[PDB]
Amino acid sequence: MQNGDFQILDYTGLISTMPRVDTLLQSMNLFTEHFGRTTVARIERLDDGAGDIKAVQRGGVRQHLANDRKKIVNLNIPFFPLDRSIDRADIQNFREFGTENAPATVDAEVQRHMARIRRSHAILKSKAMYAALKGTSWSPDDPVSDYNYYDVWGATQTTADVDFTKLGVDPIEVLEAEARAHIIDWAGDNGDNYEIVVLASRQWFSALIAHPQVTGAYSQYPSTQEILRRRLGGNANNRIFEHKNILFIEDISGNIPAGEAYIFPRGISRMFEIYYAPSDTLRDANQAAQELYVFFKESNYLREAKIESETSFLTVNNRPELVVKSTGKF
Amino acid sequence: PSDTLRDANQAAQELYVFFKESNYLREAKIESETSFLTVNNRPELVVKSTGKFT
Amino acid sequence: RMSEQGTFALAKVQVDSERMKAEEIRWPHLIGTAESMKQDATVATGLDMLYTFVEKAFKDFKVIPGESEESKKAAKFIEYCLKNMEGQTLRQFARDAATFNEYGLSVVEKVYTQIAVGEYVGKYKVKNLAFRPQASLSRTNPIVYNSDGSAIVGIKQSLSAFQNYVIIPISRVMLMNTGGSSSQALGVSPLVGCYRAWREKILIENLEVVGATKDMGGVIELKIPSQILNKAAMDPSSPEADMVRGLMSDAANAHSGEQSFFMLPSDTKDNAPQYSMTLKGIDGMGKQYSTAQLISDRKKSILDRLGAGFINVQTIHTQFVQRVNEIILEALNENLLPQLLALNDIRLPETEMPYVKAGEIVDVDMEGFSKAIQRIGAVGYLPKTPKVINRV
Amino acid sequence: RMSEQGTFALAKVQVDSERMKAEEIRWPHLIGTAESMKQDATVATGLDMLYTFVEKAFKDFKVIPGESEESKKAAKFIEYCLKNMEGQTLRQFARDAATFN
């Protein structure tokens, strides 16, 4: 590498940095994938139950039953494009920024753009699931869908608030009573022992552990999962805790508002779904959709290169009833 | 000949048909052209016949 | 494990390769640039000699059967089918298949028909190995891939070829290509590379013709006082006019013969004479570049890509022809024969599949062969079979 | 299946090829340009030497029969027919056929 006009120097190395991308929700595998053909989907509901029988005199009048109930809904899907171009001036006289004298190559910039586009698509997909879990679809600046599942299906948001400043009150005694009772009374089918999971912001999860009740619970004899001397979840970035037949997870991504936590059960059928629609191309029109489409074009006149990527999907929550907005006070 | 630069002053065909795709998988077009003249070289042996009816 | 973790990237390897070419040799144009080449007397000649030996090889073809009795019956049926196409012969097919040396690509469609009356009534022949000309194909996308650039689903033909003056499934088509890897559907024509040299070769030949015509060395120049020239122009019926008209015809006819001479007045007005006659010549030095050797270098540059460069004076040319033969045989042995036997439910093991063997492109040496048989025969290493006897 | 799905395009392959030729060598003119060539002493000589060996090859022709007795009788009849055309011989036919050069 060249130093001032009459001097030289030694090039040493390259340092690169990039922000973290979270994949916890992807890892948990809570969403089922459906590849459709159109941009409209249907969902069928069929709810049934029973009534009570009242006593009547013998030999006189009789009693009659009611009938069932049905509902049908429809939904649309948004679109997400992403494009970029490359010009001569970007590589005309710019050193590669790698080795000492290698000239800039179009391929390197193409790979950079590929990486950036992939990262952006992954981030968008991650944000979509977080938005869906909250009970609303993700479609910024696109009021065409803006579907609020609580309003669409008809429901209300259970709170199950908890206060941590009361050292003499175990917070779990409110979570159990409210959340688990509501979930059991609203499972809809006839099940048992549903597993409960909780997503907590850093502040909420950190405050929960420090509560005197939990510490006193495990302090006096070893048991297992030694909170005091080990670390929750080992050395992994995402801490894990399990107390009173519940699983607690910390949200590193920070998408959850600070101090808030969402409680939802596992195992329930078809609570979460995601649908993919085809792109705006003759090859894929009316065909089976794919996770992501990437295109690349080199100008036949040697004076341009362009990159193209697009995708279209929707995240749907089929049961707003089983999401509880835990809110902490400190 | 068709007006295309391929066959300018080159040859002739009864009917030219072309099909185009944008190469971007987003559009296509259809083309067709013809150029001909119908000539009766001997306007001597065709005789008109008009008829008064009723 | 048992799962692919990548793609061939057919749809990308193409799109890089179309940019990295001069624009006169990209797909929709190369069809015209090929036929606007060929009319060069060195380019035609290279292609003609290549087709000469390809046709020879696929004339006396043979089908080699296996060991079992089942294979021998299958080999006979294969020979009948390949020698009884209605209106087609393998020589015509070979000389149509070998067109990928001009366009990197060749498309042949297989059509099967049932037998009405004959030795193998009830079976299926091949009616025609229908050649699809590269010029009649789709000028936009000729070859269509999956939703991804992984594989090929078919080949598209233009709708303008069905007129006088559509997508064909891949399973029905036999594709041959050369000059590229398996990931280049549109193969590299051997004329790519030659193109820049052909452009130069032509331009130089044009300069030679105009240069030889314009080398006016020794041309006759005459100087006459302007008083005579001006008087003739304004007095057409004056003695000056008659003499000027005589000069314009006499000077044109001034050749060398038995009576050629010149007689001019010797008057003098200044340091220069009034009348003069001189023969011009180049006042300095002539041309230096010797355009002759420029053309010879470019001709050898073109013929080398076709292996026919020996005309400028086992060989390179013979080895080059074998390449074209093997490509055709792979399509014939591995795409038509297994399918043809499947239709007539002749299912055999791998070791019992018959195969077609092309003929020999170099004639046998009578002197060499005759004395080779004796040397082997005089020791007893040559079996006594009708196969050896029929070789004479 | 057993169905053609295309055409040879004889009527198009021609009409492209007539444009891509200098106009003195398109069909209705090439008949004149051939006979206005030949009178070059290098062009005549090339064609004459080609016809010299074509006539030689088709002079001592032979008919090769099969193995069965039926083929041998057919071969003899073929030889009689090809050698008894009224006013024609294969040498004359060969030197007329070779005019496609």
Automatic annotation (TrEMBL), chain B:
This is Putative major head protein. The chain holds residues 278 to 331 of 332 of the full protein. It comes from Pectobacterium phage phiTE.
From TrEMBL, chain D:
It comes from the Viruses. This is Portal protein. It comes from Pectobacterium phage phiTE. The lineage of its organism: Viruses, Duplodnaviria, Heunggongvirae, Uroviricota, Caudoviricetes.
